[PDB]
């Protein structure tokens, strides 16, 4: 059999307004995690409700930080939750795999710094001041994601290339660079793309905030927010939100040596899943096939599928909420790494969809890794709300053929919604969409940097594979605020025909598309299909299309 809750383990650090020496304890964790890009250390830093002084929590790799009130101001720092780029000389483009949630910050000089790139979510926060998203010195950065937050002051992206903000409120917005996209953001500036580069939607068509651990006195529980349709502003701002409150004791609590058979036992049983911060090798797919199951990872908990298996398969059921996991490919090629629904998923899940939130996939970088497709999205009405699906461009075990990964995300279900979609470096199509009435709000892609010649990436009569392809027999699709970048470093004479590919049809629509060549390392011929300017020069200027077709 099994057994509910238990021990969060030595990787979940639980503070309150004693705990002696706080700076020192978060100081240590940062020293060991700051440069630790591909290590297997994992940590979640959890703060009980209360007020905390003379704090500055610098957050390194694979560190999550959060509060345990039901609401963010229940846990207040007079002080900072800080990400900077010291370890990389003010270059913030490797500042990955960390997170902040459910805290109020009163930043020591008036502005908190969160200078991150991909897979660094900022959720359910209240900043009582400004928010600077740039490293000190204002060097390179490539984030980013804010949801369900209230920034009393101005957000300053400065050097940030791109950004997505959802269902939030901001006291100001400083600038854009290439693609700043907003949905359901109060204080968002009006649609203006290309100058400034702002894509702005009054509302988010559907959203459902990511589940989180909190304290009910001396009782741990997981708050699980309900669906909001046409979401705008925060879910918490005018007080206690809609949801359901599940005790720790109704979760199976995964520590790094459970098997996929026991994780499974536990699900078949009716227990939810809470992954404690660690790395979990499995020899079978984790299989979630009960409705309303919650599978929540702390401290960037990571699943590695061995033996070429799929890591995670969700059945054809309502309401599964997968949140806060990194899926890291093994050296043996996996056919798929994550599947949501079966091969031909026909029913609906309108009222109670399945979602992936802060689900990150890595192929290579910490050793060789391979997978044919990373995420397959079969079930109708699925919500993909912040994902980074990343074929490693640096680190260990990468190479055009060494960490080969042809396909990033393939969407086959209908009425699927992606908000905050980041997918990079696949050998073939990064994103393919075959289902009907899909919607993407915000896309960031960089193409494979390692392609060795033009022939390698030939797509029939087309040079390259689109970063985002909508199948030709698709009738209805819409995308907002989307960019694809190239940096063909191995062979800069390569040409990429386009960033985007779609049939021409009145029901297929795109808004605010762009492609960019980074320092002239290769060029795009067009933006989408054979439409839009090629990129030219070595000067980093996007080519843009505002409206299509
Ligand atoms: O590393 C692997 C990792 O790589 C990623 O891809 C890399 C990619 O991110 C990188 O792209 C470079 C790109 O970011 C860079 O963008 C610049 C942008 O930084 C610049 O910002 C300016 C600010 O500099 C400026 O600062 C102001 C300052 O001048 C003044 O002193 O003070 C002001 C305050 O008072 C301050 O504001 O502010 C302005 C706005 O006011 C910003 O615009 O802006 C320019 C364009 O305007 C923009 O181009 O450009 C580089 C080239 O020029 C790019 O190279 O490129 C790498 C390649 O070398 C990529 O590898 C991937 O995504 C990850 O998957 C990989 O793992
Ligand atoms: O006390 C509250 C504040 O705490 C901060 O956290 C500290 C943290 O930011 C700091 O990180 C250091 C990095 O900033 C540093 O990175 C270098 C840059 O500083 C530098 O920028 C300069 C720029 O300052 C100057 O004005 O102009 C120069 C050029 O025109 C520009 O270069 O650029 C460097 C690269 O060229 C870059 O390396 O590197 C240090 C060493 O690794 C980091 O230490 O570290 C502190 C250590 O404890 C943190 O406390 C918050 O960020 C603030 O928001 C808080 O208010």
Curated annotation (Swiss-Prot):
One of its GO terms (cellular component) is extracellular region. InterPro entries: Pectin_lyas_fold (IPR012334). Transmembrane segments: none annotated. GO terms for molecular function: glucan exo-1,3-beta-glucosidase activity. The active site is at 446 (proton donor). It is found in: Secreted. Changing residue 118 to N: 280-fold decrease in catalytic efficiency. Its EC number is 3.2.1.58. Induction: Is up-regulated during growth on biomass, i.e. when the bacterium is grown on cellobiose, xylan, and various pretreated switchgrass samples. It comes from the Bacteria. Substrate binds at residues 118, 138-140, 161, 390-393, 424-425, 449. Changing residue 142 to A: 13-fold decrease in catalytic efficiency while nearly no effect on substrate affinity. Changing residue 424 to A/Q: Loss of enzymatic activity. Optimum temperature is 50 degrees Celsius. Maintains 70% or more of the maximal activity from 35 to 65 degrees Celsius. Keywords: Carbohydrate metabolism, Glycosidase, Hydrolase, Polysaccharide degradation, Secreted, Signal. It catalyses: Successive hydrolysis of beta-D-glucose units from the non-reducing ends of (1->3)-beta-D-glucans, releasing alpha-glucose. GO terms for biological process: glucan catabolic process. Optimum pH is 6. Maintains 70% or more of the maximal activity from pH 6.0 to 9.0. Belongs to the glycosyl hydrolase 55 family. Exo-beta-1,3-glucanase that specifically hydrolyzes laminarin and laminarioligosaccharides, producing glucose and laminaribiose as end products. This is Exo-beta-1,3-glucanase. It comes from Streptomyces sp. (strain SirexAA-E / ActE). The lineage of its organism: Bacteria, Bacillati, Actinomycetota, Actinomycetes, Kitasatosporales.
């Amino acid at each position: 059999e099994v057994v509910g809750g238990g021990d969060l383990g030595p990787n979940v650090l639980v503070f309150d307004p004693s705990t002696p020496d706080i700076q020192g304890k978060v100081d240590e964790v940062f020293r060991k995690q700051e440069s630790n890009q591909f290590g297997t250390d994992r940590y979640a830093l959890m703060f009980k409700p209360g007020t905390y002084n003379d704090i500055n929590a610098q957050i390194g790799f694979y560190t999550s930080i959060a509060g345990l009130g039901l609401n963010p101001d229940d846990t207040t720092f007079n002080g900072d939750v800080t990400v900077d780029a010291g370890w990389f000389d003010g270059n913030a483009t490797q500042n990955f795999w960390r997170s902040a949630e459910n805290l109020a910050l009163n930043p020591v000089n008036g502005t908190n710094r969160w200078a991150v790139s991909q897979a660094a979510p900022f959720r359910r926060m209240h900043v009582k001041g400004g928010l600077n998203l740039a490293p000190d010195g204002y060097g390179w950065a490539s984030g980013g994601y804010i949801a369900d937050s209230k920034i009393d002051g101005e957000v300053g992206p400065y050097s940030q290339q791109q950004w997505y903000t959802r269902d939030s409120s901001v006291g100001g917005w400083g600038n854009g660079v290439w693609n700043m996209t907003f949905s359901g953001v109060e204080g968002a500036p009006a649609q203006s793309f290309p100058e400034p580069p702002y894509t702005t939607l009054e509302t988010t068509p559907v959203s459902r905030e990511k589940p989180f651990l909190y304290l009910d006195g001396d009782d741990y529980k997981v708050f699980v927010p309900a669906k909001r349709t046409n979401a705008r502003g925060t879910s918490w701002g005018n007080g206690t939100p809609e949801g359901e409150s599940l005790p720790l004791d109704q979760f199976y609590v995964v520590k790094p040596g459970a098997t996929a058979e026991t994780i499974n036992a536990a699900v078949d049983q009716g227990l939810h899943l809470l992954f404690t911060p660690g790395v979990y090798h499995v020899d079978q797919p984790i299989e979630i096939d009960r409705a309303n199951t919650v599978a929540l990872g702390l401290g960037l908990a990571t699943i590695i599928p061995d033996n070429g298996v799929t890591a995670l398969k969700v059945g054809d059921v309502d309401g599964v909420k997968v949140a806060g996991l990194l899926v890291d490919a093994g050296p043996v090629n996996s056919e798929t790494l994550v599947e949501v629904g079966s091969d031909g998923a026909s029913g609906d899940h309108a009222a109670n969809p399945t979602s992936l939130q802060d689900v990150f996939v890595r192929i290579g970088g910490a050793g060789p890794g391979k997978a044919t497709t990373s995420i397959v999205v079969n079930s109708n009405d699925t919500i993909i709300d912040h994902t980074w699906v990343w074929r490693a461009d640096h680190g260990e075990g990468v190479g055009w053929e060494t960490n080969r990964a042809d396909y990033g995300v393939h969407v086959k279900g209908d009425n699927v919604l992606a908000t905050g979609l980041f997918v990079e470096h696949f050998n073939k199509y990064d994103v393919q969409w075959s289902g009907e009435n899909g919607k993407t709000i915000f896309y960031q892609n960089a193409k494979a940097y390692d392609a060795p010649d033009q022939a390698a990436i030939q797509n029939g009569d087309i040079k390259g594979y689109a970063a985002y392809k909508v199948d030709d027999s698709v009738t209805t699709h819409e995308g907002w605020g989307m960019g694809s970048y190239c940096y063909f470093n191995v062979n800069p004479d390569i040409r990429q025909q386009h960033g985007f590919q779609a049939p021409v049809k009145p029901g297929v629509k795109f808004h605010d598309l762009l492609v960019v060549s980074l320092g002239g390392k290769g060029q795009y011929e067009h933006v989408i299909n054979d439409i839009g300017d090629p990129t030219s020069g070595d000067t980093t200027i996007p080519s843009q299309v505002v409206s299509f077709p």
